[PDB]
Design a protein around this motif. Structure first.
Motif, mmCIF file in Angstrom:
data_model
loop_
_atom_site.group_PDB
_atom_site.id
_atom_site.type_symbol
_atom_site.label_atom_id
_atom_site.label_comp_id
_atom_site.label_asym_id
_atom_site.label_seq_id
_atom_site.Cartn_x
_atom_site.Cartn_y
_atom_site.Cartn_z
ATOM 1 N N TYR A 55 37.829 48.819 38.867
ATOM 2 C CA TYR A 55 39.373 49.577 39.084
ATOM 3 C C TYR A 55 40.274 48.736 40.182
ATOM 4 N N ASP A 56 39.654 48.008 41.024
ATOM 5 C CA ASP A 56 40.273 46.886 41.848
ATOM 6 C C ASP A 56 39.179 45.966 42.386
ATOM 7 N N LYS B 179 39.127 43.130 44.008
ATOM 8 C CA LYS B 179 39.421 42.379 45.189
ATOM 9 C C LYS B 179 38.068 43.200 46.101
ATOM 10 N N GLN C 36 51.453 43.233 48.252
ATOM 11 C CA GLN C 36 51.056 44.236 49.080
ATOM 12 C C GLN C 36 51.952 44.563 50.471
#
Length: 468
Positions: free
Chosen positions: A229-230, A232, A461
């Motif tokens: 889901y992310d 990173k 971001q």
């Protein structure tokens, strides 16, 4: 009594290969686990093109994998996710699904699963004239498949509403779950993920609420270490936050590992300990997991003399590599800990850096004649932060020299990025500490490499809302 414990290959990304899966089986047997579920999201013949039949070479791959699983006595479950485009009122669809499952069984597979996760809540006009509800159609087709397959011992079904957030208006009053529980055959086990898609914690009362509807104990699909889901984020922390009192009330625990194959040693080991404990201490489990994990790093590659030059007092020393230590692994774990919290060391470093940044202007410029205690405290805390940054950089440097570079190369990007950012922060702290006698702008080299940050991702971001 039988119980399920194992791993689910159900993450998005590049799927694992045969060698990785075989090594996974060896590790699972070493750790006394018993379940592997095969439902990769990006397998075209699993979800997107389920109607197609396997080829001879794919058949050899599947047969080899299944035979290897039988060798180590690890149960293998094959899943299908036809919910994307299956029509329930067409007999051809049911026949195609039966034929696909028969092709799977012909290879020697034993357990099968049907998944309807992450699909729409609508039906075609044709199905509207047959089934009163979406759940009705799903349950009917699952029951037909189960009856056709010969009622195997193990069978898994994932409701579309696989989490509380997707139940409306709540778990208890959802018509979907009530219809499922009323009409689903007793021989099928149901998957569930908890209050949320990525549940931070699982109180027993929620599990009991679900049980009051499904009329059976669920099987936990835990995404505590999922990272699709992310992507990173890497997770190396121990299995934490799930109470062991759920073990008598559950039919099994299955874990979603990280996309990177070699980053899931700690999570799986901790899960094995968690289950084995009560047929639990997260800190002790993590410590044991890292102690066992250090053994597979071997030793750093060294020049092998197995006539060799030996330097004298005036000659440059030969290049030597330090071994990888337990402290390095603990620091690495704390740097990539959990989806909802950091490790104690990473959080402490962040807090200390924030404090140093906050009170930089206290003594930065022309601070002579001010409070000496403040100056000394700020300098000392800065020095400790410098030591922490040096520890991180040394950890990366030592990990770079491991002979078995497979472990590092599967997670190279994350560790390299974190050590680069630590170096940048160290430079920033030094520049802050030199303000009183140097008026130069904070710079790495002659410029600001941090301004670019992570390109477009970083610049976007930077504009997101914050608490402060």
């Amino acid at each position: 009594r039988r119980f399920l414990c194992g791993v689910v290959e159900g993450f998005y990304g590049r799927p694992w290969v045969m060698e990785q899966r075989k090594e996974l089986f060896r590790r699972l047997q070493k750790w006394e686990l018993n379940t592997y579920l095969y439902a990769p999201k990006d397998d075209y013949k699993h979800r997107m093109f389920w109607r197609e039949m396997y080829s001879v070479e794919e058949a050899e791959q599947l047969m080899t994998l299944i035979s290897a699983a039988r060798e180590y006595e690890i149960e293998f479950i094959y899943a299908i996710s036809p919910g994307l485009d299956i029509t329930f009122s067409n007999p051809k669809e049911v026949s195609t699904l039966k034929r696909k499952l028969d092709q799977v069984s012909q290879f020697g597979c034993r357990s099968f699963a049907l998944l309807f996760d992450d699909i729409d809540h609508n039906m075609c006009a044709a199905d509207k004239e047959v089934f009163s509800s979406f759940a009705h159609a799903q349950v009917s087709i699952t029951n037909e498949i189960y009856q056709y397959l010969g009622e195997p011992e193990t069978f898994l079904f994932c409701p579309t509403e696989y989490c509380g957030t997707f139940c409306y208006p709540n778990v208890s009053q959802s018509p979907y779950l009530r219809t499922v529980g009323e009409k689903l055959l007793p021989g099928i086990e149901v998957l569930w993920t908890g209050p949320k898609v990525v549940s931070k914690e699982i109180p027993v009362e929620s599990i009991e609420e679900v049980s009051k509807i499904i009329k059976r104990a669920p099987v936990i699909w835990d995404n505590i270490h999922a990272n699709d889901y992310d992507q990173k984020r890497l997770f190396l922390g121990p299995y934490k936050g799930r109470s062991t009192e759920l073990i008598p009330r559950l039919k099994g625990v299955l874990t979603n590992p990280n996309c990177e194959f070699e980053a899931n040693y700690v999570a799986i080991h901790t899960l094995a300990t968690w289950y084995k404990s009560n047929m639990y201490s997260p800190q002790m489990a993590l410590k044991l997991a890292l102690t066992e994990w250090l053994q597979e790093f071997g030793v750093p590659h060294q020049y092998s003399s197995r006539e060799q030059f030996v330097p004298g007092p005036n000659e440059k020393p030969l290049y030597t590599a330090e071994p990888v230590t337990l402290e390095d692994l603990q620091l690495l774990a704390d740097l990539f800990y959990l989806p909802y919290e950091h490790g104690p060391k990473g959080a402490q470093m962040l807090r200390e850096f924030q404090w140093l940044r906050a009170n930089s202007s206290v003594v930065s410029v022309n601070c002579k004649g001010k409070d000496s205690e403040k100056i000394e405290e700020w300098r000392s805390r800065a020095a400790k932060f410098e030591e922490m940054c040096g520890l991180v950089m040394g950890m990366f440097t030592r990990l770079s020299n491991c002979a078995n570079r497979t472990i590092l190369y599967d997670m190279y990007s994350y560790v390299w990025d974190i050590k680069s950012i630590m170096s940048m922060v160290k430079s920033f702290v030094q520049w802050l500490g030199c303000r009183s006698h140097s008026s130069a702008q904070f710079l790495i080299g002659d410029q600001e490499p941090w301004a670019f940050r992570g390109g477009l991702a970083g610049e976007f971001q930077r504009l997101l809302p914050i608490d402060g």
